[PDB]
Amino acid sequence: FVYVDGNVTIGAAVSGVTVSGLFIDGNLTIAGANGTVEFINTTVSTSII
Amino acid sequence: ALVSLSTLRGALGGGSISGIIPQEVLFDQWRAGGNWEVSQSTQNRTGFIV
Amino acid sequence: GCFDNTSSTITVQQLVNLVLSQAGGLCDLPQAGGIGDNDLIAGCIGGAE
Numbered sequence: 001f002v003y004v005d006g007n008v009t010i011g012a013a014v015s016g017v018t019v020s021g022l023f024i025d026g027n028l029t030i031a032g033a034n035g036t037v038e039f040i041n042t043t044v045s046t047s048i049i
Numbered sequence: 050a051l052v053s054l055s056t057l058r059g060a061l062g063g064g065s066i067s068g069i070i071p072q073e074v075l076f077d078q079w080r081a082g083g084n085w086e087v088s089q090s091t092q093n094r095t096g097f098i099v
Numbered sequence: 100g101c102f103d104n105t106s107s108t109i110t111v112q113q114l115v116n117l118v119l120s121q122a123g124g125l126c127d128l129p130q131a132g133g134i135g136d137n138d139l140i141a142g143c144i145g146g147a148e
Contacts, residue, residue, distance in 0.1 A: 012120035050131035
């Protein structure tokens with residue numbers, strides 16, 4: 001179990017990121033990204049944007 | 050600048066609505082009997098009406 | 100810089116990306132009227148602008 005209190009954003013021109021096994025208690029913005037991303041076993045309390 | 054007029058509604062006079070102009074006369078003589086034909090020249094000419 | 104009302108530092112890589120990522124685009128260009136072969140249209144010729 002893991003709990004996060006905040007928002008997570010993929011910055012402009014980012015690539016190669018990977019996330020797993022987190023409970024994100026906030027939005028998840030994806031702007032200016034360059035692809036090559038992968039999310040697994042994650043939860044979001046609000047709207048991805 | 051951006052434009053969409055230059056599309057199919059481009060600067061042309063509107064599509065290609067053009068028919069050979071009823072231009073001047075060239076020859077008119079009638080013949081009976083066997084098959085008959087005449088010839089003309091393309092020099093300085095780009096169309097004809099028959 | 101003064102990021103997040105906080106005195107901290109960022110990598111130049113990030114600053115470069117931020118500027119370019121916000122560098123605008125052709126979408127904001129204006130819509131014009133008259134045109135002619137006198138004027139010119141942007142495009143890629145043999146791999147070059």
